[PDB]
Ligand binder design. Structure first.
Ligand SMILES: CCCCCCCCCCCCCCCC(=O)O
Length: 133
């Protein structure tokens, strides 16, 4: 998790519309989701716990978790999901099961850039972030 710590600003997004469409996100929310460019703040809480916070004009969302420990998450579009985050060969692997679809998120860091790949069924989205601090 150490590679992911800090603040990251979203620069570009591709395919997020298609992800939201597949997940059943409603029209108004999708309009918002396609516009916003969130920050992502990843913090070490000690004791193996971490927080991810996402700030945007839509809302602030966050979650605190330990690696390899299933937890309840609410997504930004207000689905209740069962989530599980691990790190494997440098890749943060974050699954979200909403009981209809499983969303697979992979985050990777190379230098100043964090790339978040989001997959639902065959749909692929990539969101690229730059390091702020
Ligand atoms: C901040 C905009 C929220 C818009 C609502 C979209 C809800 C779809 C949820 C997809 C799961 C979360 C994807 C996070 C990807 C990332 O870290 O950039």
């Amino acid at each position: 998790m150490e590679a992911f710590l800090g603040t990251w600003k979203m620069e570009k997004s591709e395919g997020f519309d298609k992800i939201m469409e597949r997940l059943g996100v409603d029209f108004v929310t999708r309009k918002m989701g396609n516009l916003v460019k969130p920050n992502l703040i990843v913090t070490d809480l000690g004791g193996g716990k971490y927080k991810m916070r996402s700030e945007s004009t839509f809302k602030t969302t966050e979650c605190s978790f330990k690696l390899g420990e299933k937890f309840k998450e609410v997504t930004p579009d207000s689905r209740e999901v069962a989530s599980l985050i691990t790190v494997e060969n440098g890749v943060m692997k974050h699954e979200q099961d909403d009981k209809t679809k499983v969303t697979y998120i992979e985050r990777v860091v190379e230098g100043n850039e964090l790339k978040a790949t989001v997959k639902v069924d065959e749909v692929v989205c990539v969101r690229t972030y730059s390091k702020v601090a």
